[PDB]
Amino acid sequence: NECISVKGRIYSILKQIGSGGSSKVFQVLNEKKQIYAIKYVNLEEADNQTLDSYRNEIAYLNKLQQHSDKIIRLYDYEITDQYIYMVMECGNIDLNSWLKKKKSIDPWERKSYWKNMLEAVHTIHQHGIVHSDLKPANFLIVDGMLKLIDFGIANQMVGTVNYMPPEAIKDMSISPKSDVWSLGCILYYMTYGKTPFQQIINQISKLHAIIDPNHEIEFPDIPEKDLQDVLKCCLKRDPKQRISIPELLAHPYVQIQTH
């Protein structure tokens, strides 16, 4: 049988996904065979902040669904003092697995996926939310369409610093521009199959190279010249100079039609 209930509904679990500890995400099947995904958080360990973070994540995630189909759908959820059950869209595969998988993405796909990311991220910015932790894993490929799975609000389910922006580090001792840099690192990786500072192994090194104005990032000339410009503009170390989401939505690479 195998049965999970959510506000009075049964779902047949099929397998844990990604995580396995603190929180837990599973693939599932319901009544009309329809396949979904059930995320589960055991609140018997959460602090007020953790708790509040999931509350806040759910609220926003619930509200922003209507503003865009480029954000993972939350069909329902159940919140209790001991647990949280979220019924969400099933994951075909995350942009991260997909990438390190093959290694020759169709230019048209690159651009299509790129438009998806911009839409989703732009949407959260409009409501005052800065993800601040964007990495390829935050995106799920659903029917050829990329969707943002989380908002970076809840401490949702290693630990790279390759997508980290210069300003994040320098300040140590946030802005929408910060999401631009990371989305840039992701596009840059879908363009050169590598991340801007992936070749720098010593961790203390990358962090110094990411902020060093004299550490010129490289941009191997390629056919799609519009793509080359996006990358360069998304990676300007000065956030005030860095292109914005609105400017990006108006950029040739995204506007001019050449399938």
Binding annotation for ATP? 17-25, 39
Residue 106 CB coordination number (10 Å): 8
Angstrom distance (rounded) from CA 40 to CA 118 = 28
Which residues touch 193 (CB under 8 Å, ≥6 apart)?
103
- Tokens 């169709």 appear where? 106
Residue type, 196: P
Q: Is the alpha carbon torsion for 110, 113, 115, 117 positive or negative?
A: negative
Answer yes or no: are the C-beta atoms of 236 and 216 closer than 8 Å: no
Q: Which residues are annotated as a binding site?
A: 17-25, 39
Catalytic residue, candidates 133, 171, 179, 212: 133
**Strands, DSSP E only, in the chain?**
4-5, 10-17, 23-29, 35-42, 74-79, 83-88, 93-94, 139-142, 145-148
The answer to whether 76 is a known catalytic residue is: no
Q: Which residues are catalytic?
A: 133
